[PDB]
Amino acid sequence: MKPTVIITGASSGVGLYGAKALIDKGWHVIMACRNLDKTQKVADELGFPKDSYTIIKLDLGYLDSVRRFVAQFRELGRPLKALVCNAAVYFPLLDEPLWSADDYELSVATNHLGHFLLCNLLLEDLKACPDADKRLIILGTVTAPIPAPPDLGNFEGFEAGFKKPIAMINNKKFKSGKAYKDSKLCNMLTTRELHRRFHQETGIVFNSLYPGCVADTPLFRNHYSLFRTIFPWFQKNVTKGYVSQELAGERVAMVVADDKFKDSGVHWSWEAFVQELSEQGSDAQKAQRMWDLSEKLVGLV
């Protein structure tokens, strides 16, 4: 009966409060999380009604776990109306790179490659769903806390198979902050390419979303702590573009469910949401390369 949405990384921050807001709207939320105990705990602490959500294990750092999640979701027999790619990792105090179960640098492997496989797999479920209005939302960047800009180069690391000791998409020296930025740029390019390749054929809406500066989540906590040691007058709610976790989740819920956000191939940013189209140019060319190589790394070919 209830429309069904999958949210990755729903045990914390934006994903958790997006699930809360979507449950309030009458949806059934699949909480695709790696830590089943932590997820159940925070779902109870916020009083989620048990008939409105289901917890299924997903570890985006293990490609076979991504396939196992899809198999387990299909066992439920719920038609898939929406997918929110929300989970992300950032390691602000990392000197040397960490590796995924498939020997890919952890940030890109989790934030991008895991989601990339999940989107390509779940595209068949979104197609099979009979609803006219079906949406795939990707949490992205500000425009279409870390001052270093992302730089994919010519994907030399991807072209070489991206296996360790390769640590960056352009095969340069590992930097954990730039690694996060590079992986979030890949999310944005995935949205561009999903729209270009599949919107006309399938009718599915493919958009990215910047919910605002959600300073209270754990993601950038170390940056805020470092700010306080230098500026002791500093609090998180004074950050530029600060939004609460509850409001961020409501904005996710709007982009998933509301009629105002039916256009495909745009980036929603924040107040009543500014829209940015993803047209053509230089990043459209990068997106095509990003897609082709990512298919090889995740075993789709």
Ligand X SMILES: NC(=O)C1=CN([C@@H]2O[C@H](COP(=O)(O)OP(=O)(O)OC[C@H]3O[C@@H](n4cnc5c(N)ncnc54)[C@H](OP(=O)(O)O)[C@@H]3O)[C@@H](O)[C@H]2O)C=CC1
Cα separation, 129 vs 151, in Å, equals: 37
Q: How far is the CB of 84 from ligand X (least distance, A)?
A: 9
Chain contacts with ligand X (rule: CB under 6 A): 8-9, 11-15, 33-35, 38, 58-61, 86-89, 110, 139, 184, 210, 213-214, 217-220
Judge whether 115 and 167 are in contact, CB under 8 Å.
no
Q: How far is the CB of 276 from ligand X (least distance, A)?
A: 15
Q: Which is nearer to ligand X, 11 or 129 (CB)?
A: 11
**What's the number of CA atoms in the CB half-sphere (13 Å) around residue 104?**
25
Q: How far is the CB of 69 from ligand X (least distance, A)?
A: 9
Residue whose C-alpha is closest to residue 55's, from 82, 36, 42: 36
Instruction: Output the CA–CA distances (angstroms, integers) from residue 193 to 20, 178, 245, in the order listed.
Output: 29, 22, 29
Q: Which is nearer to ligand X, 127 or 221 (CB)?
A: 221
Q: How far is the CB of 198 from ligand X (least distance, A)?
A: 22
Q: How far is the CB of 258 from ligand X (least distance, A)?
A: 19
